Amino acid sequence: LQEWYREEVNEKLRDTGTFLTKDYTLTRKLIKSSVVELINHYRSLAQYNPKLLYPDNIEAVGKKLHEYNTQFQEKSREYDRLYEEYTRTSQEIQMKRTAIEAFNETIKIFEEQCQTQERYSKEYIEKFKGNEKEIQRIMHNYDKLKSRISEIIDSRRRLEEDLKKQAAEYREIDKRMNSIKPDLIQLRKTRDQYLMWLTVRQKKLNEW
Amino acid sequence: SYYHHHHHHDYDIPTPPRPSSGELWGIHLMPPRILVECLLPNGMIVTLECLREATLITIKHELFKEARKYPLHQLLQDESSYIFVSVTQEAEREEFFDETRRLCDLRLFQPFLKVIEPVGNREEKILNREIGFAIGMPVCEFDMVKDPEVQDFRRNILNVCKEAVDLRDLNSPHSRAMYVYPPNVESSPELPKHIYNKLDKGQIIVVIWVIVSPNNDKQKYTLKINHDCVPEQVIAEAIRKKTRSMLLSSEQLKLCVLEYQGKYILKVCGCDEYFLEKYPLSQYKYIRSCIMLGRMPNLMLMAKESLYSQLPMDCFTMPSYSSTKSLWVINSALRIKILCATYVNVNIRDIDKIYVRTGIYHGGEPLCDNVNTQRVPCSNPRWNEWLNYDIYIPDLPRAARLCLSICSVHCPLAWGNINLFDYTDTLVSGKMALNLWPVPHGLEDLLNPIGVTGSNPNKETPCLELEFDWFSSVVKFPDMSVIEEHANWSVSREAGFSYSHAGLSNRLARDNELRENDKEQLKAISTRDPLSEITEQEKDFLWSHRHYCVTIPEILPKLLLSVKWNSRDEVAQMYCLVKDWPPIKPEQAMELLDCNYPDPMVRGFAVRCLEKYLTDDKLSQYLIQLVQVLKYEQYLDNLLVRFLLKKALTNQRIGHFFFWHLKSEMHNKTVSQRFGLLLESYCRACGMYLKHLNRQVEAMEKLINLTDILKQEKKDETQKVQMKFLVEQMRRPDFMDALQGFLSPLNPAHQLGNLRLEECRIMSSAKRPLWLNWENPDIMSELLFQNNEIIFKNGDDLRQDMLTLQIIRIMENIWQNQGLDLRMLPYGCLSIGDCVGLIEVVRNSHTIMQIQCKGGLKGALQFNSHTLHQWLKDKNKGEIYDAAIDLFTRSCAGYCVATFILGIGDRHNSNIMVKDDGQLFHIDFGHFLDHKKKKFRERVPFVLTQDFLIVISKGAQECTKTREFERFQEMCYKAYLAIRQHANLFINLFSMMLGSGMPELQSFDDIAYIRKTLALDKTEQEALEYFMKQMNDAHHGGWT
Ligand SMILES: O=c1[nH]cc(F)c(=O)[nH]1
């Protein structure tokens, strides 16, 4: 009677109806005369209690344990590396978005300043008429003010494009995570089954 | 030949998260002189050239002498009618009221200033900036939040903040000093037996100190009083001995004592700890250390009015923000319309087809989990189905929530969870816009309920919008009253059931007389740990005998996981047992604030436990776990928050760590809002400590920016060059301001005075951690430590250390207060940022490697096993020597057990350290519950080399066989078991930490390692032998 017959019970229940002090226990959607008698029968557990579908080389099955483990742990680094990029990008992105809001608010203060001077200066343009001496130098100041706001909107634009280029690269990172993920699970699932076929030799396995 | 001439064609030799931008946008450290456009009321743009570190006083006072050479001068008031303002990097227009501030310290976005006169004439109130700084997001960012809950939190939480400031000025100023300087005291007055016997039948020798004039000289009145006498008594005996005389009768003394006695309080020399209430001196921690360390206390008589001098009045101000229809009426099953995700980033090449898995949950789930068909797969994915959930709508528990996830063909893409009732008790009905969260590293599992409830605030993410069945009216949850009736009805209804029943497991049939085998299968379950999953039989067993289970309060944690929350019948009765269940010990109650106990009645109860039992000492022990448990609370405003907030406002030493633990996680947008709001509230009410926290914050920020430059620009330079740069920068005044007058956040009792830059330096590690060294500016520096030094480390995630060093601290107090003395040195460590923290330096200790580099002789042949012993002998000589080994033997023994139980990363010559006095202790623990086995054990990470074995048995040969080692080997057994009896706590502590994104704690099976290594499934005699066996096989001989 030795296919279905706590911690590594749950590790073989992971991701799959499934089933498997001093007697026996039946576990996924725990349950406490004979053993093989009762499981073949239930293979709907409603009618017992109100609220069971899924049950040669030696040394080169263990080199395949080394090989699928070099694949897996290279493949895991691929995942582990990209997750960081994914987050850094996310982060960097948002800092930009804030900067844009800050740029924006910088501009609004300056646009108001180019407005602010005309009220107070074009009272002094008409009162007295200071002559071409006074107003050539109130003209100089205003010349800068605008050519500065040029520079700011240049600077903000130049950022907004980069947001997109980052944002573009952001999407591309998740794209490739989501293709790498599913293969990573099978590479992992088979490397558990490959080591299950080997196991006693517990202590020979760590090098592969 | 080597490689079979295989070319790797691809490979080309050409080819710490970050980055927190610093003083100006896009640059870390602003150029030493810089140009800044000052904008005036008259629309004129000067462009002052300014030194990096110049104040706004300096800039204004000059700007109003360089604007005189520009037009329209008489359109500007006297400067004093004006104040600067500009855009910050957080992006707010911040009016600059503190003109003592410096230009580097402003966190400008672009280099410019604008003049105005102050609107919002309550100037005082626009020091929300202080709170905004402390928190690192502005308070106005909360004023703009629409959501009622958030605003309803802000206003209603002030209930708590008020009641807290009430309790402070109750019996003032004493009560104020009490808040500020709470007594640091062990929770038990009983003095452990090995501590006692260092006393000659209950006596310490102490040393009171005094000052008369000017402040200059001091004087040592060395008493010898009873361990279990109080500060008052001790203050007297000191004053007796100061003022005995030949010009004074006995009775004349008695009067001159009384009048002097209570004008003084006991300080500790060197740090701002004070002994301010009725406690046996033993019980105050400082004393109990001094006993253990072979030290004579150095206290101090400080004049109550020279202390009440210092405490400022907190000055708490209120801010500017000053028919239903029962769920049980609703007759239908639950259904939910899905509709369409939009932003779904997947390859149409690699991946086949995609769907939206959904479920209803309560921690673990109350129906069959369902999906939709795999529609418009990959390109433009849109469903428009109605998922039908086979739970009736009256059968929803209060806590329940929909969990969902978009999956592929098959593994998950994105997830998001929603509370089925809002915070006002109201079933969710209408249309929702839910933005998803990415899947974590370790999470393969398809759906993710342990994750945070609510939408992602990141806009550019999978926005899966959906619809909720709407019943013509606002569908609320029943009152308590309404739930009591249905419980009593379901009780009376149960009494007249009939003899037999198809599944009479749920019901009794034994009635008021239960069998004696049964009453002791319950207490047999009662004892078992949290992680031992329970069989349905046993649940139904418990659930039937539920009313006897009130005999055994401690059983509750199990009992609750027995109830089916999909049967409101059952649930309603549970609400009434729990209503008035016997209160339990806090160690068992905290289990009931983990993810598996999401109900609010349950969680209320669990607070009622803490309110009653949990002490300001034992709270401060477990604060980390309680702050992490906030993340499993459904709504902002709740009982646990109101508790912790209040304790924090009652006790300024908790307050302190409560800030930093929240402030620590402010980068992590799963809690940025929640914790923000909470910190705001704390910051508004804690009064003057805010100003102390604002200096600590200010300091940590300067350090962050510093290391950031070092780790990016100044790598690929010699240490030598980096070290020039470091000192050159610490020289500057904005730094000297920022880094000198403040409190250590590792422990705010210690002050940090001027920085000696002699002893400040960049360690050799590649992360570039800083070794900083401050003057202790206490009056009695001498009697504690003239120089205080701690390590700042930008780059590493501290919080796995932070936990293990906590866990160790607990194992020590477990062991030691059970009488059995293994001295662990859980050095101080504090996470304050993304990968930013602080580590207490332990002076006069070395890594075993350093020991061997010292004792290594001349020409590099081979290092000796004895070197350690020989270096340790050179330190400790005499009766001293024997005692230095006892210490070593005792610490080695604890650190053997602790290391093994936790499975912390393998120990070797570079991460085990030894002190001059001969205590051994581990640093730099790595990943804890065996995180490196995800790559392909039940490990021994402390494998005792020859080196230790020799030193253990005073230098013998073939050391494994001495008596010296039989002692040691016994300590290990006595220590292994002592923990095992408290293994529930250790489960619950790890269990509460799953809320953090620590990759070593992803879900309960991670924690399950600790079961096998404590061997809880066995009986104790088996464990001992399993432990012996596991210890024998790493060492290769010794353990029978
Ligand atoms: O039992 C208690 N009630 C109230 C308190 F403030 C406290 O510390 N302990």
Q: Does the distance separating the beta carbons of B72 and A124 come in below 8 Å?
A: yes
Instruction: Name the CATH architecture for the domain at B480-692.
Output: Alpha Horseshoe (1.25)
Q: Does the distance separating the beta carbons of B88 and A102 come in below 8 Å?
A: yes
Closest chain B residue to A191, measured at CA? B936
Q: Which of A47, A128, A145, A174 to mutate to test the interface with B (most CBs of B within 10 A)?
A: A174
**B1033 at interface of A, judged by CB pairs closer than 8 A:** no
Q: Does the distance separating the beta carbons of B71 and A141 come in below 8 Å?
A: yes
Q: Does the distance separating the beta carbons of A6 and B533 come in below 8 Å?
A: yes
**Paired strand residues for B430:** B468
Secondary structure of B477-515 as H, E, C letters: CCCHHHHHHHHHHHHHHHHCCCCCCCCCCCCCCCCCCCC
Question: How far are the Cα atoms of B665, B708, B710, B758, B853 from residue B761, in angstroms, in the given order?
Answer: 28, 15, 12, 8, 22
B509-514 long-range contacts (CB < 8 A, ≥24 apart) are: B514/B545, B514/B548
Q: Are strands B299-303 and B333-337 parallel, antiparallel or unpaired?
A: unpaired
Instruction: Report chain B residues whose CB lies below 8 A from the CB of A11.
Output: 1005
Query: H/E element holding B227?
Result: none
Q: Are strands B33-39 and B112-116 parallel, antiparallel or unpaired?
A: parallel
C-alpha triplet B775, B776, B777: angle, nearest 5°? 95
Cα(B223)–Cα(B365) distance, integer angstroms: 65
Which of B93, B350, B534 is opposite residue A105, by nearest beta carbon? B93
Instruction: Report chain A residues whose CB lies below 8 A from the CB of B18.
Output: 88
Cα(B395)–Cα(B389) distance, integer angstroms: 12
How far is B857 from chain A, CA to nearest CA, in Å?
36
Q: What's the one-letter identity of residue B904?
A: I
Cα(B136)–Cα(B129) distance, integer angstroms: 10
List, in sequence order, the alpha helices (H) in B667-688: 672-685
Question: How far are the Cα atoms of B43, B161, B392, B418 from residue B422, in angstroms, in the given order?
Answer: 51, 25, 19, 9
Chain A, 78 to 117: residues with Cβ < 8 Å from chain B are 79-80, 83-84, 86-88, 90-95, 98-99, 101-103, 105-106, 109-110, 113-117
Q: Does the distance separating the beta carbons of A181 and B91 come in below 8 Å?
A: no
Q: Closest Cα to residue B361, out of B437, B486, B249, B447? A: B447
Cα(B149)–Cα(B146) distance, integer angstroms: 9
Q: Are strands B836-840 and B845-847 parallel, antiparallel or unpaired?
A: unpaired
How far is A172 from chain B, CA to nearest CA, in Å?
8
Contacts of B712 (CB under 8 A, 6+ apart): B18, B19, B28
How far is A30 from chain B, CA to nearest CA, in Å?
5
From the CA of B646, how far away is ligand 1's center (Å)?
A: 11
Q: What's the one-letter identity of residue B220?
A: K
A141 in Cβ contact with A124 (< 8 Å)? no
**A170 at interface of B, judged by CB pairs closer than 8 A:** yes
Q: Does the distance separating the beta carbons of A73 and B935 come in below 8 Å?
A: yes
B754 in Cβ contact with B774 (< 8 Å)? yes
Cα(B364)–Cα(B370) distance, integer angstroms: 15
Q: Does the distance separating the beta carbons of A106 and B110 come in below 8 Å?
A: yes
Cα(B416)–Cα(B453) distance, integer angstroms: 7
CA atoms lying within 13 Å on the CB side of residue B542: 26
C-alpha triplet B726, B731, B732: angle, nearest 5°? 110
SS3 state at A106: helix
Which of A102, A144, A171 is opposite residue B87, by nearest beta carbon? A102
Cα(B575)–Cα(B484) distance, integer angstroms: 8
Q: How many CB atoms lie within 10 A of CB B24?
A: 21
Written as one string, the DSSP assignment of B990-1002 is HHHTTTS--TT-S
Cα(B397)–Cα(B851) distance, integer angstroms: 62
Cα(B112)–Cα(B80) distance, integer angstroms: 20
Q: Which one-letter DSSP state was computed for residue B428? A: -
Cα(B971)–Cα(B953) distance, integer angstroms: 14
B659 in Cβ contact with B679 (< 8 Å)? yes
B814 in Cβ contact with B821 (< 8 Å)? no
B107 in Cβ contact with B90 (< 8 Å)? yes
Q: Is B866 exposed, middle or buried (0-12, 13-18, 19+ CB in 10 A)?
A: middle
Contacts of B719 (CB under 8 A, 6+ apart): B762, B764
Closest chain B residue to A169, measured at CA? B345
Query: H/E element holding A94?
Result: helix A63-124
**Paired strand residues for B464:** B434
Order of strands, sheet of B112-116, starting from the edge strand that comes earlier in the sequence:
B48-51, B33-39, B112-116, B83-87, B93-96
Chain B, 233 to 262: residues with Cβ < 8 Å from chain A are none
Question: How far are the Cα atoms of A49, B396, B490, B570, B573 from residue B567, in angstroms, in the given order?
Answer: 15, 8, 12, 5, 10
Closest chain A residue to B410, measured at CA? A182
Order of strands, sheet of B829-833, starting from the edge strand that comes earlier in the sequence:
B761-762, B770-775, B787-794, B836-840, B829-833
Chain B, 85 to 144: residues with Cβ < 8 Å from chain A are 86-93, 109-110, 112, 114
Which of A73, A114, A182 is opposite residue B411, by nearest beta carbon? A182
B522 in Cβ contact with B549 (< 8 Å)? yes
Query: H/E element holding B563?
Result: none
B113 in Cβ contact with B86 (< 8 Å)? yes
How far is B21 from chain A, CA to nearest CA, in Å?
9
Q: Is B517 exposed, middle or buried (0-12, 13-18, 19+ CB in 10 A)?
A: exposed
Chain B, 921 to 940: residues with Cβ < 8 Å from chain A are 935-936
Query: H/E element holding B37?
Result: strand B33-39
Q: Does the distance separating the beta carbons of A11 and B1005 come in below 8 Å?
A: yes
Cα(A134)–Cα(A123) distance, integer angstroms: 13
C-alpha torsion sign, points B445, B449, B455, B457: negative
Q: Closest Cα to residue B593, out of B573, B577, B614? A: B614
Largest distance between two CA atoms of chain B: 105
Contacts of A76 (CB under 8 A, 6+ apart): A184
For the record, the structure tokens of B337 come out as: 């319309």
Secondary structure of B887-947 as H, E, C letters: HHHHHHHHHHHHHHHHCCCCCCCCCEEEECCCCEEECCCCCCCCHHHCCCCCCCCCCCCHH
- The verdict on domain A59-199 having CATH code 1.10.287.1490 is yes
For B297-422, where are the E strands, in sequence order?
Answer: 299-303, 325-326, 333-337, 355-361, 386-392, 401-407, 412-419
Cα(B841)–Cα(B827) distance, integer angstroms: 8
Instruction: Report chain A residues whose CB lies below 8 A from the CB of B534.
Output: 30
B592 in Cβ contact with B560 (< 8 Å)? yes
Closest chain A residue to B370, measured at CA? A29
Q: Are strands B475-476 and B325-326 parallel, antiparallel or unpaired?
A: parallel
Question: How far are the Cα atoms of B96, B334, B396, B552, B718 from residue B424, in angstroms, in the given order?
Answer: 40, 20, 16, 35, 61
Give the CA radius of gyration of chain A: 36
Q: What's the one-letter identity of residue B959?
A: C
SS3 state at B390: strand
Closest chain B residue to A202, measured at CA? B937
Closest chain A residue to B1007, measured at CA? A7
Q: Which one-letter DSSP state was computed for residue B453? A: B
Largest distance between two CA atoms of chain A: 116
**Paired strand residues for B85:** B95, B114
Size of interface A-B (CB pairs under 8 A): 157
B448 in Cβ contact with B407 (< 8 Å)? no
Closest chain B residue to A167, measured at CA? B460
Q: Which residues of B197-219 are buried (b: 16+ CB within 10 A; e: fewer)?
A: eeeeeeebebbbbbbeeeeeeee
Cα(B694)–Cα(B680) distance, integer angstroms: 13
Q: Closest Cα to residue B413, out of B370, B368, B369, B377? A: B377
Cα(B948)–Cα(B919) distance, integer angstroms: 12
Give the CA radius of gyration of chain B: 33
B721 in Cβ contact with B714 (< 8 Å)? yes
Residue with tokens 């006790």: B651
The length of chain A in residues reads 208
B173 in Cβ contact with B328 (< 8 Å)? no
SS3 state at B773: strand
Cα(A58)–Cα(A166) distance, integer angstroms: 50
B46 in Cβ contact with B40 (< 8 Å)? yes
Which of A31, A73, A120 is opposite residue B75, by nearest beta carbon? A120
Q: Closest Cα to residue B457, out of B482, B426, B483, B434? A: B434
Phi, psi of B426 (to 5 degrees): -110, 120
For the record, the structure tokens of B369 come out as: 């989990």
CA atoms lying within 13 Å on the CB side of residue B263: 7
Contacts of B140 (CB under 8 A, 6+ apart): B92, B128, B132
Task: Report, in this order, helix, strand and coil percent for chain A, each rounded to 5.
Answer: 70, 0, 30
Closest chain A residue to B43, measured at CA? A117
Instruction: Report chain A residues whose CB lies below 8 A from the CB of B75.
Output: 120
Cα(B97)–Cα(B117) distance, integer angstroms: 11
Resolution in angstrom units: 3.5
How far is A2 from chain B, CA to nearest CA, in Å?
24
Instruction: Report chain B residues whose CB lies below 8 A from the CB of A148.
Output: 37, 45
Cα(B440)–Cα(B415) distance, integer angstroms: 10
Cα(B1007)–Cα(B930) distance, integer angstroms: 10
The helix/strand count (H/E) of chain A reads as 4, 0
Q: Does the distance separating the beta carbons of B91 and A101 come in below 8 Å?
A: yes
Q: Does the distance separating the beta carbons of B438 and A174 come in below 8 Å?
A: yes
Experimental method: X-ray
In CATH, what number does B325-476 get?
A: 2.60.40.150
**A61 at interface of B, judged by CB pairs closer than 8 A:** no
Secondary structure of B136-195 as H, E, C letters: CCCCHHHHCCCCHHHHHHHHHCHHHHHHHHHHHCCCCCHHHHHHHCCCCECCCCCCCHHH
Question: How far are the Cα atoms of B4, B517, B663, B822, B963 from residue B514, in angstroms, in the given order?
Answer: 79, 9, 53, 46, 54
Q: Closest Cα to residue B998, out of B797, B796, B794, B792? A: B797
**B77 at interface of A, judged by CB pairs closer than 8 A:** no
Cα(B83)–Cα(B113) distance, integer angstroms: 10
Task: Report, in this order, helix, strand and coil percent for chain B, each rounded to 5.
Answer: 40, 15, 45
Cα(B989)–Cα(B622) distance, integer angstroms: 8
Peptide bond into B173 cis (omega under 30): yes
